[PDB]
Amino acid sequence: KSAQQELKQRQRAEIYALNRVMTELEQQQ
Amino acid sequence: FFVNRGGLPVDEATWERMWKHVAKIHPDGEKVAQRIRGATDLPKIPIPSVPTFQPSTPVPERLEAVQRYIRELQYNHTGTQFFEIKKSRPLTGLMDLAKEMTKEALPIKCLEAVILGIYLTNSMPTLERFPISFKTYFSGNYFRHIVLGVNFAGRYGALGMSRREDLMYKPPAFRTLSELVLDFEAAYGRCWHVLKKVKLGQSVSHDPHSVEQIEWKHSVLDVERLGRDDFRKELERHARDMRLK
């Protein structure tokens, strides 16, 4: 339960870092 | 564009598949994964607050706020769709899905934005909502897009999410449905896409517990086989069909 919240938080932070990277890539090429 | 089935947190298989997709698509892809995966210095993303409105706030202002929230979620460029949307589900299931979207706050695309817009405008009974789908063509490939057409005080606008600014939000100022659809077609032509099909749905119930289905394809218009005047005539016929319940 409390560990799943930390899991979701880590996953969301990584998802948004990845989304920034891929957004820059796509806006370029 | 993979689809995450199994809910959030993303399962091990879907997570690994997303990262493999990133490694192959992105140059520096595995360097991207090495930098991001397990990193402890990543930015904390605040969970965007779902907008709530005073009864004195005019509906177009509320629409601006709703579109701002949808934009805040960010467009999903990761190549993995995080919410599976079965379009034939009853409304209440899609609304539970939209609530979970608001609570978990991940990037989204066209259809997720449509469902979110319905969920966030159910409190505006003077506002009619109906999906609008576009099928276009460019460089030998066919493309599909969807927005939530909107009707307030006899004027048409749209909510949605898109790669381009001119392919989502439209303030409810278009006097006829045909003018709204033609604005979308003009934006498409501006980005060198040929508009092939427009699929307009019926009005969506404001009851979030309704078991009815969204009627996505009440009018399917083949733009090229119709021509200009018949296209406008059919769009106005759909507008009439909607305003007559």
Author numbering:
A (entry chain B): 25 to 53
B (entry chain A): 60 to 304
The publication says:
Detyrosination/tyrosination is one PTM that involves cyclic removal and reincorporation of the C-terminal tyrosine on most α-tubulin isotypes. VASHs were first identified as secreted angiogenesis regulators, and predicted to harbor a transglutaminase-like protease fold. Small vasohibin binding protein (SVBP), a 66-residue protein, acts as a chaperone-like peptide, which is helpful for vasohibin stability and enhances the tubulin carboxypeptidase activity. The identification of VASHs as major tubulin-detyrosinating enzymes establishes the nature of molecules that start the detyrosination-tyrosination cycle, and this helps to extend the understanding of the tubulin PTM in cells.
After purification tests with different fragments of VASH1, a catalytic core-containing complex VASH144–315-SVBP1–66 was purified to homogeneity and we solved the structure of the heterodimer at 2.28 Å resolution by Pt-SAD phasing (X-ray statistics in Supplementary Table S1). The final refined heterodimer structure contains residues from 60 to 304 of VASH1 and residues 25 to 53 of SVBP. The catalytic core of VASH1 adopts a mixed α/β fold comprising seven α helices, six β strands and a 310 helix. In the structure, SVBP forms an extended α helix and is wrapped by VASH1 α1-α5 and the loops among them. In the structure, VASH1 and SVBP form extensive interactions, burying a surface area of 2256.5 Å2. However, structure analysis revealed that the sidechain nitrogen atom of H204 is actually hydrogen bonded to the carbonyl oxygen atom of L226. Therefore, in contrary to the canonical Cys-His-Asp triad of transglutaminase-like cysteine proteases, vasohibin proteins adopt a Cys-His-Leu catalytic triad. The VASH1-SVBP electrostatic surface has a conserved, large positively charged region stretching from the active site toward the β1/β2/β5 region and the loop linking α3 and α4 (L34, named similarly hereafter). Through structure-guided mutagenesis, we identified that K168, H204, Ser221, R222, and the L34 region are important for the detyrosination activity of VASH1-SVBP. Disrupting the VASH1-SVBP interactions significantly reduced the activity of VASH1, which might be stimulated by the interactions from SVBP through stabilizing the active site of VASH1.
